[PDB]
Design a protein around this ligand. Sequence first.
Ligand code: NA
Ligand SMILES: [Rh+]
Length: 129
Amino acid sequence: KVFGRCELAAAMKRHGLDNYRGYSLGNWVCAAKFESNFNTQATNRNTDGSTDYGILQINSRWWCNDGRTPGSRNLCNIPCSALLSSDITASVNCAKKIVSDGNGMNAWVAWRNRCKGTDVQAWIRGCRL
Ligand code: NA
Ligand SMILES: [Rh+]
Protein backbone atom coordinates (compact mmCIF):
# COMPACT_ATOMS: atom_id res chain seq x y z
CA LYS A 1 0.00 0.00 0.00
CA VAL A 2 1.30 3.52 -0.90
CA PHE A 3 -0.07 5.93 1.78
CA GLY A 4 -0.96 9.54 1.21
CA ARG A 5 1.03 11.92 3.47
CA CYS A 6 -1.99 12.93 5.65
CA GLU A 7 -3.41 9.34 5.55
CA LEU A 8 -0.12 8.03 6.98
CA ALA A 9 0.04 10.89 9.54
CA ALA A 10 -3.48 9.91 10.76
CA ALA A 11 -2.60 6.18 10.83
CA MET A 12 0.64 6.90 12.81
CA LYS A 13 -1.24 9.19 15.27
CA ARG A 14 -3.99 6.59 15.82
CA HIS A 15 -1.21 3.96 16.52
CA GLY A 16 0.45 6.16 19.22
CA LEU A 17 3.57 7.61 17.43
CA ASP A 18 2.75 11.36 17.95
CA ASN A 19 5.30 12.49 20.61
CA TYR A 20 6.35 8.83 21.22
CA ARG A 21 9.70 9.10 23.15
CA GLY A 22 9.40 12.86 22.49
CA TYR A 23 9.29 12.59 18.63
CA SER A 24 6.47 14.71 17.13
CA LEU A 25 4.32 13.13 14.36
CA GLY A 26 6.11 15.12 11.57
CA ASN A 27 9.40 13.31 12.48
CA TRP A 28 7.73 9.91 11.82
CA VAL A 29 6.07 11.10 8.56
CA CYS A 30 9.39 12.62 7.35
CA ALA A 31 11.25 9.37 8.22
CA ALA A 32 8.67 7.29 6.32
CA LYS A 33 8.83 9.59 3.25
CA PHE A 34 12.62 9.25 2.86
CA GLU A 35 12.86 5.59 3.98
CA SER A 36 10.05 4.12 1.82
CA ASN A 37 8.23 6.91 -0.12
CA PHE A 38 5.22 5.89 2.12
CA ASN A 39 5.20 2.41 0.52
CA THR A 40 4.52 -0.49 2.94
CA GLN A 41 6.02 -2.96 0.39
CA ALA A 42 9.48 -1.29 0.14
CA THR A 43 12.47 -3.65 0.61
CA ASN A 44 16.20 -2.93 0.33
CA ARG A 45 19.16 -5.28 0.77
CA ASN A 46 22.06 -4.07 2.99
CA THR A 47 25.76 -4.84 2.28
CA ASP A 48 25.88 -7.18 5.38
CA GLY A 49 23.13 -9.41 3.79
CA SER A 50 20.33 -8.06 6.07
CA THR A 51 17.27 -6.43 4.45
CA ASP A 52 15.18 -3.36 5.42
CA TYR A 53 11.39 -3.80 5.32
CA GLY A 54 8.30 -1.61 5.08
CA ILE A 55 7.35 2.01 5.51
CA LEU A 56 10.17 2.60 8.13
CA GLN A 57 12.72 0.20 6.54
CA ILE A 58 13.23 -1.93 9.68
CA ASN A 59 16.32 -4.19 9.45
CA SER A 60 16.43 -8.05 9.74
CA ARG A 61 19.91 -7.79 11.44
CA TRP A 62 18.15 -6.96 14.76
CA TRP A 63 14.39 -6.62 14.54
CA CYS A 64 12.64 -9.33 12.45
CA ASN A 65 13.18 -12.82 10.98
CA ASP A 66 13.37 -13.13 7.16
CA GLY A 67 14.93 -16.64 7.13
CA ARG A 68 18.14 -15.44 5.34
CA THR A 69 19.97 -13.11 7.78
CA PRO A 70 22.30 -15.56 9.56
CA GLY A 71 23.44 -14.74 13.13
CA SER A 72 20.71 -12.04 13.44
CA ARG A 73 18.14 -11.25 16.16
CA ASN A 74 14.30 -10.96 15.99
CA LEU A 75 13.79 -8.40 18.78
CA CYS A 76 10.25 -7.45 17.53
CA ASN A 77 9.36 -11.22 17.49
CA ILE A 78 7.88 -10.98 13.93
CA PRO A 79 8.48 -12.28 10.43
CA CYS A 80 9.91 -9.38 8.35
CA SER A 81 6.93 -9.89 5.96
CA ALA A 82 4.60 -8.52 8.70
CA LEU A 83 6.37 -5.15 8.07
CA LEU A 84 5.08 -5.08 4.45
CA SER A 85 1.33 -5.27 5.33
CA SER A 86 -1.17 -2.53 4.33
CA ASP A 87 -1.83 -2.55 8.13
CA ILE A 88 1.06 -0.59 9.77
CA THR A 89 0.47 -2.08 13.29
CA ALA A 90 3.60 -4.35 13.14
CA SER A 91 5.83 -1.56 11.76
CA VAL A 92 4.60 0.94 14.41
CA ASN A 93 4.95 -1.50 17.38
CA CYS A 94 8.46 -2.49 16.18
CA ALA A 95 9.45 1.20 15.65
CA LYS A 96 8.42 1.96 19.27
CA LYS A 97 10.90 -0.73 20.47
CA ILE A 98 13.68 0.63 18.16
CA VAL A 99 13.24 4.32 19.15
CA SER A 100 13.24 3.21 22.86
CA ASP A 101 16.62 1.42 22.64
CA GLY A 102 18.96 4.39 23.41
CA ASN A 103 19.72 6.04 19.97
CA GLY A 104 16.19 7.40 19.45
CA MET A 105 15.36 8.21 15.83
CA ASN A 106 19.11 8.28 14.92
CA ALA A 107 18.50 4.50 14.27
CA TRP A 108 16.91 5.69 10.95
CA VAL A 109 19.70 6.92 8.65
CA ALA A 110 17.17 8.82 6.47
CA TRP A 111 15.78 10.58 9.60
CA ARG A 112 19.26 11.70 10.81
CA ASN A 113 20.30 12.91 7.32
CA ARG A 114 17.02 14.39 5.94
CA CYS A 115 14.64 15.14 8.86
CA LYS A 116 16.69 15.86 12.03
CA GLY A 117 17.10 19.62 12.56
CA THR A 118 14.55 20.52 9.81
CA ASP A 119 10.98 21.90 10.19
CA VAL A 120 9.36 18.45 10.32
CA GLN A 121 5.91 19.93 11.30
CA ALA A 122 5.71 20.87 7.54
CA TRP A 123 5.10 17.11 6.95
CA ILE A 124 1.65 17.26 8.70
CA ARG A 125 0.72 20.80 7.51
CA GLY A 126 -2.84 20.92 6.09
CA CYS A 127 -3.72 17.43 7.49
CA ARG A 128 -7.00 16.90 9.38
CA LEU A 129 -5.55 15.37 12.64
NA1 NA B 1 16.70 -11.33 12.13
RH1 LIG C 1 -4.67 1.05 11.72
